[PDB]
Amino acid sequence: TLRSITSPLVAHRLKPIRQKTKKAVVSILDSEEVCVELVEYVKEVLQISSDGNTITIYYPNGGFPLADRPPSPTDNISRYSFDNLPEKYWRKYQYASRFVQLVREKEPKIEYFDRYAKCILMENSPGADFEVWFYDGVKIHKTEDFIQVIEKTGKSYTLKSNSLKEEIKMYMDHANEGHRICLALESIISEEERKTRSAPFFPIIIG
Amino acid sequence: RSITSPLVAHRLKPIRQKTAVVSILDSEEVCVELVVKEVLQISSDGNTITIYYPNRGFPLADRPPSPTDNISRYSFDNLPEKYWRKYQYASRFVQLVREKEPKIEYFDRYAKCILMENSPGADFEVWFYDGVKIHKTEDFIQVIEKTGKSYTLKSSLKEEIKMYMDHANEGHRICLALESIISEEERKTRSAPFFPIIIG
């Protein structure tokens, strides 16, 4: 069971992207499906559901040239659950998940303009990244692992654990309020998309 | 006061229109330059009017003349009648901006919904992805079919279009519920404003 190792990917609300590695192309489609074309001709396509829990695999007949769109499916097709997926495709599923993990860290879920900064909560929940692009060129990025400060000069620092330099704290004190605010809205609005179950309320731009 | 209510320019993006010149400043203050020779600056909340004269003077710049010492402040109530029709010009203008100024853009699978800033009872435009368009108002609803066949109903079932009108009504209910939820939170937080908002 792939489960014993990794976890199902999440691509919900991800804008489209196509990147060519050497071994193959990876995509996020308008459907928020994830496509891995193994490879210059495509010999194998994996199409993972936006949830992670479904993997569709189709081949050609013959020895599928490269393209904008991925190749429309064939009758040589299969479907697996995350649990049923054969070992053979596991490292492919993990390429797709690493990639998607990359995108979500940089995919805004909420953009909020305070008097003093642009605040960005990312899609890499739980514990998503949080960027604060101060309008006077200060930058504070918060991560589960750590916090990066960049000063108006370019002095850039990490704090995996505080006294900063006091003046840093005015900015960090703000960053924190912004995080508390974007985390309260995300909860409120998320509550609403539960109660209504209509169309996604994310991402949002505020102010 | 007896007549017009104080204007509201909260969250309105800047604009200078020439006719007198009227402006909404980056401060959400409303400026009327009469022609210059007189400047009225109404507060974003409508209740304070600052009036200053040149020391004519003031050639028509693209920005309002910086402040002078021939200056007055009034309350909405204190405002002398000499200035009432100037205030009312400013109020009509702002009513016009607000009706076309969006507070909420929501992207449904079928359409773009826009609740405007002309509360209470704000306009609600539904720009369907297929080219259908519905515009709700307190007075009436305009329907534009894909053809162009406009139809300003004022009170009715015409069939088929009811599929779209039902969607439009859902979107309104959804946008009117988000406004309430995010409005509660803004009441409880004291942070920077939460509107406008784009969702989707």
Swiss-Prot record, chain A:
Homodimer. Interacts with CEP152 (via N-terminus). Interacts with CEP78; this interaction may be important for proper PLK4 localization to the centriole and PLK4-induced overduplication of centrioles. Interacts with CEP131. Interacts simultaneously with TENT5C and CEP192. Interacts with TENT5C; this interaction leads to the TENT5C recruitment in the centrosome. Interacts with CEP85; this interaction may be important in cell migration and centriole assembly. Serine/threonine-protein kinase that plays a central role in centriole duplication. Able to trigger procentriole formation on the surface of the parental centriole cylinder, leading to the recruitment of centriole biogenesis proteins such as SASS6, CPAP, CCP110, CEP135 and gamma-tubulin. When overexpressed, it is able to induce centrosome amplification through the simultaneous generation of multiple procentrioles adjoining each parental centriole during S phase. Phosphorylates 'Ser-151' of FBXW5 during the G1/S transition, leading to inhibit FBXW5 ability to ubiquitinate SASS6. Acetylation by KAT2A and KAT2B impairs kinase activity by shifting the kinase to an inactive conformation. Changing N76R: Does not affect the interaction with TENT5C. This is Serine/threonine-protein kinase PLK4. The modification Phosphoserine is found at S72. Signal peptide: none annotated. Belongs to the protein kinase superfamily. Ser/Thr protein kinase family. CDC5/Polo subfamily. Cryptic POLO box 1 (CPB1) and Cryptic POLO box 2 (CPB2) domains can simultaneously bind to both TENT5C and CEP192. It is linked to Microcephaly and chorioretinopathy, autosomal recessive, 2: A severe disorder characterized by microcephaly, delayed psychomotor development, growth retardation with dwarfism, and ocular abnormalities. It comes from Homo sapiens. Residues 107-207 form the Cryptic POLO box 2 (CPB2) domain. Residues 1-106 form the Cryptic POLO box 1 (CPB1) domain. Disulfide bonds: none annotated. It is found in: Cytoplasm, Cytoskeleton, Microtubule organizing center, Centrosome, Centriole; Nucleus, Nucleolus; Cleavage furrow; Cytoplasm, Cytoskeleton, Microtubule organizing center, Centrosome. The chain holds residues 586 to 804 of 970 of the full protein. Induction: Down-regulated in HCT 116 colorectal cancer cells, leading to aberrant centrioles composed of disorganized cylindrical microtubules and displaced appendages. Down-regulated by p53/TP53.
